[PDB]
């Protein structure tokens, strides 16, 4: 029963009921169904036309909000000393939603999701006072974010010839500009992303339980196109992801215990009464006590 | 050219904006959408599903012992069994539900809730309970005569081992807000108490103590508004293996 | 009327005296992969009444120290019957999995089992940062057992497990739970040896209790594929 519903449902006037054999208050939880009882059948009600909408709770309203997915800083200095490996005026990042608990827990209320992600890169720069205390100014640096599909050879350095971006989707943006915004389509080999995977990736026995290679959108490489200046800077790049055209299937319980890792659904639980393993809900004195009840 | 005026709020990145953005992958054909069972279009579909509450949220109860209320045969008449603070958006027996978890993502809520209680004693055990709901004003009732004055239901354990107490929408405003873990006029919902109507009579071969599981859902009247950040989750640092995602 | 139920699938049959109006997962009945949804351009085998015949797993004893039991599908029945043979000899499958959980106890017993079917129940290890292994997740027909059923062994609440296709076995009212499942996968077909579509968890919420002689109380589960079909057809492995 599709039944397009735009606002909440109204109530009707109720009268004294004494009919026997029909009992609306009694039901069967044993059946795996929710009680099909109206407020009319339990108490004596009045006619109430309800004008409260239901749009704020739509799944595309619930999920389509630009949430932080990554936050990584790197130096804009001249890297001569043999250190800072894989982070020398560039960084890479495998796009995953399981790194910041807000968007992760929100997306993990559904078993499958189908959306067109919209990425937004927000860049800030800051001078280094490593050997001094002098602020000379902030430069207008252009950055390049190349979207490398997962399983493809990413740029190993920032001077490499892999940045020419023959077919790879690339974007160039200055720090002074508005944040760079692009759209990634629903690029999954299946009809919906698998937020939860109950299998192993490959045929070999040890195949990284829980991680589906199809769910991984790709790989995001970010460098500074400019050459280094006589002084050093620290460039922080924040990525924001906003799902669009969302479809969601098979809702799930929300995560209660704190997340332990980005790879797996492991749990440890907090120490004290709230969100521990023994106790999820904070304790109270007894069942017949009120945590804070009015006393005048 | 067209003479253009730059308004305030141009260039700003509002994380709740709704605009079209640049296609990164041109002429991409998304996978044909198959039919998967269980599609959710509104989050108010999954608040209307019953879910156990932890009325026994005490220290002595650990794990699944917190999800049932052990009632016993009493020797004094008109005896209180338990009470449930109806705080739907602050820490309490209703915090870890489906309606409660979905509601802690929003500030304002409306509509009426339904409490369902299933009896998990033996078939040979009989009894009668009275589940009361008192509107927000005043203290929690401790005797049955003062608690019967609110909307209640008298329940007789029979073949139908589940009853429904409905908490009607009783408010002056259209909505209720969270605003704190506080006792405020536009935040409180009232109390739910359970007394013994007659007793829990049980034969000798049956177990003397019989548990009682309570469920809580939302009606069609329910509504939520002013979405926010849920407090049920939070991190103080980066999760494990998050640095491996950068290499 | 709604307490007497008979399920006839192939040459197998189940007759129940205390039923509870069997449920359907998400209001869906299994089907046969229509021509528009199908991607594998190859004639599938549809062995009916050879598979789709109510295979019965080994019973488990319900006690006081019991936390819960789970079986992953089709991992549980990947080695029994002609279903297991077709699963081995073929590369892809698509099945229905009608479930029936039997549990009996006298009128002086009290108890409650939450018989829930979780889709894609990716479970996590407790108190460690390492991911679960193969012999930890893949238990076969013996299934596993919950050690923290409070959090369903994934960090998510058990209280909210009634959002999944579920039924209860309240000993005072019914003694059986029957759940019908659809395909429920983002893919039209899947490799059965690595991935599990469903997870049948039986968590005793109210512990079994009686002041009688306390005789043994087993819990029996009967799985039945529905509208199962296979593609592939290479050697056994």
């Amino acid at each position: 029963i599709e039944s397009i519903i735009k606002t909440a449902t109204d109530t009707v006037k109720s009268e004294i009921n004494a009919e026997l054999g029909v009992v609306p208050s009694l039901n069967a939880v044993e059946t795996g169904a929710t009680s099909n009882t109206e407020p009319e059948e339990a108490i004596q009600t009045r006619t109430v036309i309800n004008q409260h909408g239901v749009s704020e709770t739509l799944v595309e309203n619930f999920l389509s909000r630009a949430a932080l997915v990554s936050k990584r800083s790197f130096e804009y200095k001249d890297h001569t000393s043999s250190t800072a490996r894989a982070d020398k005026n560039f960084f890479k990042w495998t796009i995953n939603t399981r790194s910041f608990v807000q968007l992760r827990r929100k997306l993990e209320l559904f078993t499958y999701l189908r959306f067109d992600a919209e990425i937004t890169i927000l860049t800030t720069v800051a001078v280094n006072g490593s050997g001094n205390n002098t602020y000379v100014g902030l430069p207008d640096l252009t950055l390049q974010a190349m979207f490398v599909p997962t399983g493809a050879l990413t740029p190993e350095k920032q001077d490499s010839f892999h940045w020419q971006s023959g077919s790879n989707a690339s974007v160039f943006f200055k720090i002074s500009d508005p944040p760079a915004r692009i759209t990634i389509p629903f690029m999954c080999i299946n009809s919906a992303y698998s937020v939860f995977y109950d299998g192993f990736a490959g045929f070999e026995k040890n195949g990284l339980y829980g991680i589906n290679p199809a769910d991984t959108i790709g790989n995001l490489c970010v460098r500074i196109v400019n050459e280094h200046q006589p002084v050093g800077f620290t460039v922080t790049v924040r990525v924001y992801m906003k799902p669009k055209h969302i479809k969601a299937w098979a809702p799930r319980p929300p995560r209660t215990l704190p997340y332990m890792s980005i790879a797996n659904a492991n749990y440890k639980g907090k120490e004290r009464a709230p969100n521990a393993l023994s106790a999820i809900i904070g304790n109270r004195d007894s069942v017949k006590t009120m945590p804070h009840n009015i006393v005048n | 050219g067209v003479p253009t005026y730059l308004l305030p709020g141009s260039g700003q990145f509002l994380t709740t904006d709704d605009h079209s953005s640049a296609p990164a992958l041109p002429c991409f054909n998304p996978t044909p959408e198959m039919h998967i069972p269980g599609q959710v279009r509104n989050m108010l579909e999954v608040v209307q599903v019953e879910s156990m509450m932890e009325i026994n949220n005490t220290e002595s109860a650990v794990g699944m012992e917190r999800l049932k209320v052990d009632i016993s045969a009493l020797t004094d008449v008109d005896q209180l069994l338990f009470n449930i603070p109806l705080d739907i958006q602050l820490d309490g027996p209703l915090r870890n539900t489906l309606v409660g978890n979905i509601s802690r993502y929003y500030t304002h809520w409306s509509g009426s809730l339904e409490m369902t209680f299933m009896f998990c004693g033996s078939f040979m055990a009989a009894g009668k309970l009275i589940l009361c709901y008192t509107p927000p004003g005043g203290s929690c009732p401790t005797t049955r005569e003062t608690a019967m004055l609110g909307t209640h239901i008298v329940w007789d354990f029979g073949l139908q081992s589940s009853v429904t107490l409905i908490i009607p929408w009783i408010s002056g405003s259209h909505y209720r807000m969270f605003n704190n873990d506080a006792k405020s006029t536009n935040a409180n919902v009232g109390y739910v108490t359970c007394f013994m109507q007659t007793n829990l009579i049980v034969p000798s071969e049956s177990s003397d103590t019989c548990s009682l599981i309570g469920f809580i859902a939302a009606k069609d009247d329910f509504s939520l508004r002013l979405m926010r950040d849920s407090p049920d989750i939070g991190q103080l640092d980066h999760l494990h293996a998050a640095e491996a995602a950068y290499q | 009327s709604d307490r007497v139920l008979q399920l006839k699938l192939g040459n197998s049959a189940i007759v129940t005296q205390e039923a509870a109006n069997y449920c359907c997962a998400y209001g869906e009945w299994p089907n046969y992969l229509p021509d528009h949804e199908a991607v594998a351009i190859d004639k599938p085998t549809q062995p009916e009444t050879a598979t789709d015949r109510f295979y019965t797993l080994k019973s488990v004893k319900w006690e006081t120290g019991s936390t819960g039991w789970w079986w992953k599908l089709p991992d549980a029945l990947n080695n029994i019957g002609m279903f297991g043979q077709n699963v081995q000899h073929h590369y892809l499958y698509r099945s229905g999995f009608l479930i029936h959980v039997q549990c009996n106890a006298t009128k002086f017993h009290q108890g409650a089992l939450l018989v829930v079917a979780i889709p894609e129940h990716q479970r996590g290890a407790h108190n460690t940062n390492t991911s679960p292994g193969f012999d930890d997740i893949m238990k076969g027909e013996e299934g596993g057992t919950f050690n923290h059923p409070y959090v369903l062994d994934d960090g998510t609440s058990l209280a909210c497990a009634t959002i999944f296709p579920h039924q209860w076995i309240n000993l005072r009212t019914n003694n059986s739970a029957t759940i019908v499942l659809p395909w429920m996968n983002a893919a039209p077909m899947d490799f059965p040896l690595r991935h599990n579509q469903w997870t049948l968890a039986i968590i005793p919420v109210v512990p079994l209790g009686t002041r009688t002689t306390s005789s043994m109380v087993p819990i029996t589960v009967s799985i039945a594929p529905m509208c199962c079909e296979f593609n592939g057809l290479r050697h056994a492995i």
Partner: antibody, heavy 122, light 98 residues
Framework: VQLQESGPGLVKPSETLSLTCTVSGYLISNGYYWGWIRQSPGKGLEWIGSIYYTRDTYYNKSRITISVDTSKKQFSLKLYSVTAADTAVYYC???????????????????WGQGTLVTVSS | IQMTQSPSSVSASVGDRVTLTCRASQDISSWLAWYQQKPGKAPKLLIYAASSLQSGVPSRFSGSGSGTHFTLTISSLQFATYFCQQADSFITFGGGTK
């Protein structure tokens, strides 16, 4: 990565025990709690405290006031009222942990640095 | 938690199977790290999570199971103070040697 610390070693009668430590290979603003572990002859490998780049400062003894400065990529501690029991080696570490709740778990010291023998004399 | 890592200061010949044990007060999980402090220099993490090796470490070591016993095995001797850190509640560094 490379951790190098520097401060006064043989001159500290009762004053604040200031001591800094510059981080080289890793950006101190990406994670990996940064703290101090002193190998005292009196006890042997005691953990003083640590700090996250969000200035979280989980301590052991609470008079140390560890701080952080990602601008100069370094962090410091300050032992107050040092009297002859704080003569140690004072390593400067980073450790992969998770103090997400006010208590840490699984905090393993991957990078260690080198000692700074601090003497409380006179 | 107080890690009594010390049975003794054991001495072994080259090519032995010297074994160090680390007892814990609490029944901690597999949260256990083994460190090697060669004399005159800083310690180094040998194995963490009670069974996991490091990158750039000699593959002559192994770890025990969870709980309280927490042994350490060196398959070949080819010399340093070996420390035992619990890292379940905080950093403790149970004192011990070889």
């Amino acid at each position: 990565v490379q951790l190098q610390e520097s401060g006064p070693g043989l001159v500290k009668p009762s004053e604040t025990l200031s001591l800094t430590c510059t981080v080289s290979g890793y950006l101190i603003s990406n994670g990996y709690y940064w703290g101090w572990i002193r190998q005292s002859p009196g006890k042997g490998l005691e953990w003083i405290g640590s700090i996250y780049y969000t200035r979280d400062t989980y301590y052991n003894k609470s008079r140390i006031t560890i701080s952080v400065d990602t601008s100069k990529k370094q962090f410091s501690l300050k032992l107050y009222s040092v009297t002859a029991a704080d003569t140690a080696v004072y390593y400067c570490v980073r450790h992969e942990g998770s103090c997400n709740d006010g208590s840490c778990y699984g905090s393993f010291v991957d990078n260690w640095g080198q000692g700074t023998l601090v003497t409380v004399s006179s | 938690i107080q890690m009594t890592q010390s049975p003794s200061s054991v001495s072994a010949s080259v090519g032995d199977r010297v074994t160090l044990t680390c007892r814990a007060s609490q029944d901690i999980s597999s949260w256990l790290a083994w460190y090697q402090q060669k004399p005159g220099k800083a310690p180094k993490l040998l194995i963490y999570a009670a069974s996991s090796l490091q990158s750039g470490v000699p593959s002559r070591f192994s770890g025990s199971g969870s709980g309280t016993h927490f042994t350490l095995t060196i398959s070949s001797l080819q010399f340093a103070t070996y420390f035992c850190q619990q890292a379940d509640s905080f950093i403790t560094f149970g004192g011990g040697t070889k």
